Amino acid sequence: DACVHHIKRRDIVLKWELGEGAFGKVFLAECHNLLPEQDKMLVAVKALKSESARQDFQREAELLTMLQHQHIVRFFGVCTEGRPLLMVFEYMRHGDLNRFLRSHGPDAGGEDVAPGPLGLGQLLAVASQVAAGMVYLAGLHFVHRDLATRNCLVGQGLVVKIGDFGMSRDIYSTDYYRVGGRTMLPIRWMPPESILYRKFTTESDVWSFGVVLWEIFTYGKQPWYQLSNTEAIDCITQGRELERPRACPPEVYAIMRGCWQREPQQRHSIKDVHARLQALAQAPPVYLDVL
Numbered sequence: 640d641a642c643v644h645h646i647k648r649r650d651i652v653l654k655w656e657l658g659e660g661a662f663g664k665v666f667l668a669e670c671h672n673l674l675p676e677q678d679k680m681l682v683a684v685k686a687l688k689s690e691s692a693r694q695d696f697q698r699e700a701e702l703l704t705m706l707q708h709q710h711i712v713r714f715f716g717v718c719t720e721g722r723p724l725l726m727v728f729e730y731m732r733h734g735d736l737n738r739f740l741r742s743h744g745p746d747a748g749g750e751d752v753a754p755g756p757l758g759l760g761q762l763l764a765v766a767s768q769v770a771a772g773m774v775y776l777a778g779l780h781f782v783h784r785d786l787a788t789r790n791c792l793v794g795q796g797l798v799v800k801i802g803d804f805g806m807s808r809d810i811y812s813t814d815y816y817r818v819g820g821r822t823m824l825p826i827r828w829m830p831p832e833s834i835l836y837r838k839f840t841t842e843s844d845v846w847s848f849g850v851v852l853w854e855i856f857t858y859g860k861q862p863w864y865q866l867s868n869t870e871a872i873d874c875i876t877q878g879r880e881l882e883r884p885r886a887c888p889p890e891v892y893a894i895m896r897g898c899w900q901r902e903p904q905q906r907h908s909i910k911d912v913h914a915r916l917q918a919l920a921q922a923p924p925v926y927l928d929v930l
């Protein structure tokens with residue numbers, strides 16, 4: 640049921656590689672006649688590799704065209720015209736959110752970003768945008784299962800959008816727990832009911848967002864980095880919480896804990912978390928200076 644848009648291979652011109660995963664690589668490419676205002680624009684093309692993949696390929700592209708929001712990474716279509724199989728994405732020049740945060744933690748000044756550490760309003764801006772994307776998926780009633788900064792992209796103008804890599808399992812292999820197995824769980828981002836009861840719901844995503852929110856104010860630092868995977872599981876199932884980041888106001892840390900209520904339905908909705916963050920984000924400097 641291909642209701643997903645298609646792109647002729649001839650309109651796609653690979654320039655160079657951006658990154659690589661076990662199951663695929665990403666290229667920067669020129670895409671002609673894709674958008675009307677740009678006769679030529681830049682896209683990020685993912686090439687695959689398997690009959691399991693060619694069948695899997697269709698499923699994700701259906702999903703990707705399906706969820707299109709202002710804070711979900713734009714998905715233009717696919718090139719099924721012969722092989723290799725391609726997926727055409729909007730190009731986000733600042734890379735994933737984790738790299739971006741780490742590059743602007745203390746300790747340069749560029750086109751989109753002020754010199755040195757990201758400001759409180761900027762840190763809040765980044766968090767607000769991710770929330771909105773999670774608000775969208777929650778309305779669509781989808782669960783991300785792997786919400787982390789490594790799966791969020793930053794675009795020119797400091798635009799943050801949600802994606803689901805990758806890539807993530809490869810470049811950030813230290814962020815996953817290998818179960819034998821043979822799968823991998825980002826245990827440091829998962830709530831107690833997911834580690835114990837193996838349940839992943841919408842209210843499991845707010846827990847993930849708090850950890851993402853934690854990540855943002857720690858400038859990309861891994862949660863429970865001082866702990867091993869087994870030791871991390873212990874702390875999480877025993878109700879121990881991540882300490883307040885230095886760059887995090889007591890007002891904002893209260894939001895994290897609201898996402899970290901042990902019982903799934905005692906947590907706040909993602910609509911409610913986004914609203915508090917956006918207000919803080921849009922808040923006048925005067926209000927934030929004394930925060």
Ligand SMILES: Cc1cn(-c2cc(NC(=O)c3cc4cc(c3C)C#Cc3cnc5ccc(nn35)C(=O)NCCCCCCCO4)cc(C(F)(F)F)c2)cn1
Pocket residue numbers: 657658659660661663664665683685699702703706711712728729730731732733734735792801802803804805806
């Ligand atoms: C089971 C299941 C999963 N999903 C599901 C899958 C996805 N797919 C991806 O997230 C995805 C996947 C991927 C690339 C991109 C993305 C976006 C991009 C990119 C991109 C655009 N500009 C740049 C600039 C630099 C770099 N990358 N980019 C860079 O430095 N890249 C690093 C290169 C790593 C190479 C490995 C290839 C990884 O392959 C999204 C969602 C959802 F819903 F979130 F949108 C859901 C649905 N069902």
